[PDB]
Amino acid sequence: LDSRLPAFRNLSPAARLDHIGQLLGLSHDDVSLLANAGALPMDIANGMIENVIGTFELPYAVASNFQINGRDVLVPLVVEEPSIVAAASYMAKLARANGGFTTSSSAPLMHAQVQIVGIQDPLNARLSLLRRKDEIIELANRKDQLLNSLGGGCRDIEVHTFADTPRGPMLVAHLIVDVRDAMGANTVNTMAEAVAPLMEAITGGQVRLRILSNLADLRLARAQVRITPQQLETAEFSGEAVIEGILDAYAFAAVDPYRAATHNKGIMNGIDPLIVATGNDWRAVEAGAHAYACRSGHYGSLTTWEKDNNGHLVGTLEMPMPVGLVGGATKTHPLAQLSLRILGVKTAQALAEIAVAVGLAQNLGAMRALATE
Amino acid sequence: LDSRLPAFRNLSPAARLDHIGQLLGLSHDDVSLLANAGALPMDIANGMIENVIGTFELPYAVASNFQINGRDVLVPLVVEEPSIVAAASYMAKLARANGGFTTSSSAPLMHAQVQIVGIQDPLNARLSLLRRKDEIIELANRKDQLLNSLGGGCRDIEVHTFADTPRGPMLVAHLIVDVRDAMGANTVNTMAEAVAPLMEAITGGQVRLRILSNLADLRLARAQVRITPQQLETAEFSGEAVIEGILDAYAFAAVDPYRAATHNKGIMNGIDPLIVATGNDWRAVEAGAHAYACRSGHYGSLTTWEKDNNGHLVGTLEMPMPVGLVGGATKTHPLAQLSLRILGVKTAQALAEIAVAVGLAQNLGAMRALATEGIQ
Ligand SMILES: CC(C)(COP(=O)(O)OP(=O)(O)OC[C@H]1O[C@@H](n2cnc3c(N)ncnc32)[C@H](O)[C@@H]1OP(=O)(O)O)[C@@H](O)C(=O)NCCC(=O)NCCSC(=S)C[C@@](C)(O)CC(=O)O
């Protein structure tokens, strides 16, 4: 694949769609899903959520120029706001000159919380759980034999205590679960429910909440980009001066939450539309993102911007990125499936890596514009 | 208006649309926007964002039972995830028995930031700006005649310093701008750019960033709800015990960020789908919400839950809520306009007040389910 899409910006929607179909070797019938309204039929929509009266469209777009670990990728995006897609495509074009985006990710590990109340010895009860951790892990894994055969499963447990709250002592167990190609919510919740009776027997306490955490800080995806000063030169400003301006803008985000909120919103402009296009839960991605940004005790920037030993601008994005290829609405929505086909992703972590590349690109675009006006 | 919508959950989509069309007196043309797929014309879609190749549908639903300061309201929602609309609807049903949701909001005030670097005396420059604030405020208000004539504009300035960063001393001025019925980005960005030269002249620094803040903590919207124990009784648990379980779930969120993230995500399950239904920017609402949740230096719960002196469960939500009745897709998408019609909102702050009511109801529904689920 060549993702450069020359003159895409100026083609009609129909022409653009035909080119995409040609590049990818889409069938006529796949192209029909975008060439005509109504790919989400009403019997599917009506079964997805409650009280349905119709469907609501947003535009479906494709960003150009992306390249991830040396492979060109086409990126579908669904959103209402202008300039997002153009900026992403432009920053991807710049990145390609220097190797594109380089990405990595952790295993798809999600937390399942099990909250325990009713005991006067939470700190002791924590150790009772840990002593019996293999038993707990085995009980969790008995509940999803398929996931274990797919290469996932409950890997570990961690236990945290809150001995002094206004509502009395609490203990919180986390199952740590590899959820393979799912976002993970229903997969881990089921394990949390399975182990609850055993945790009650061990601790002597009462289990209350059994629920994933959206702070998915064991499910991290990472992206890098590099930009040279020559690329950032304008009529008004040297590239070197733009790079210094971007570093100043970054330091401003790092110290001031009023700026960090906006800086990180720019990142989510790039990410959330890919999450929507793939039928994934964008509230989950947002909650993970912004809670992670404040993990230090200060709400700061998700990205970093620095100058390397050659004077080049180097950016990173590392963040939680819980997404699926299966589960929820990813399989339900025919255009979610088409998006995954467009992307060519074969694992959920591959999708997560593309997401962070797009977020990094969108922040780059915002940094560049704001440093050059 | 009566928003109870009896039997709604079991009616066909077409019958549901008929029933709300009767209640509202929707025109033929309004109803027909949902007779067939494709209500967003491709020429409008193509003008909205770049590189458009088609459209992407999500389900469009209406939550029932909502009442805001005594008035029934119907709430359109666009989202992919189950249980949200039902939970919001059921908690709204319970709320009605005790007066519905009570709401308030601040004026639609947004921050514009102007970042100034390279000043050798930033703390002194800040006073030079504050002395000249009327001048700055008048410059800000020079160009947007329409906003001024509608009762908005720049109201004030504040100035903050960060004298020691790794990139040297920074001054940051904020324009405080009433943006009336807009979210406000273009309004405040434009003002930030306009005032920049003058600030530079006063301070002697280089202006760098000129840009809104999404941490819209002067644009707050507030909701309250009340639920009695009799309303919460289940087969297994008294309503009193359910209240205690909900308070336990709240305290857990207040102390543990791993729970708070999830808890707040449930609020946003309620809010974001209304933002989407009205053509508004949900990334801006998300950023304001979650940044606000950590203003203290601890990432906590946006909602509060207590028991009052009568033993009733009382909940609050106060948060930033920047939304528009105008701008972008809110104007150009025919269903964003239909949603506004369904809602009956006449100002952006009224839309914000409904948003927080729905977020509050969603969080209550989520907690209630988790607090009452038996052990397996
Ligand atoms: C890219 C923009 C929108 C237009 O740039 P321009 O200099 O006109 O680009 P140019 O015309 O040179 O085209 C260069 C490349 O840019 C792409 N491109 C430009 N315009 C379009 C378009 N209309 N459609 C598609 N592609 C476009 C395209 O890839 C093209 O390559 P090609 O010539 O090979 O096709 C430029 O205004 C810009 O970079 N904006 C970045 C900031 C921006 O508004 N971002 C949008 C979201 S807003 C955001 S993230 C919120 C913030 C800013 O508050 C976040 C924060 O505060 O941090």
Curated annotation (Swiss-Prot), chain A:
Source species, domain of life: Bacteria
Coiled coil feature spans: none
Catalysed transformations (reactions): (R)-mevalonate + 2 NAD(+) + CoA = (3S)-3-hydroxy-3-methylglutaryl-CoA + 2 NADH + 2 H(+)
Keyword Secreted appears in the UniProt entry: no
Active site per database record: E81 (charge relay system), K265 (charge relay system), D281 (charge relay system)
Pathway given in the UniProt record: Metabolic intermediate metabolism; (R)-mevalonate degradation; (S)-3-hydroxy-3-methylglutaryl-CoA from (R)-mevalonate: step 1/1
Biological processes per GO annotation: coenzyme A metabolic process
PROSITE patterns in alphabetical order: HMG_COA_REDUCTASE_1 (PS00066), HMG_COA_REDUCTASE_2 (PS00318), HMG_COA_REDUCTASE_3 (PS01192), HMG_COA_REDUCTASE_4 (PS50065)
One Gene Ontology MF term: hydroxymethylglutaryl-CoA reductase (NADH) activity
Subunit note: Homotetramer.
Function: P.mevalonii can use mevalonate as sole carbon source. With this enzyme mevalonate is deacetylated to HMG-CoA.
NCBIfam families associated with the record: HMG_CoA_R_NAD (TIGR00532)
Family statement drawn from the similarity comment of this UniProt entry: Belongs to the HMG-CoA reductase family.
Protein name, entry field: 3-hydroxy-3-methylglutaryl-coenzyme A reductase
Species: Pseudomonas mevalonii
Gene designation per UniProt: mvaA
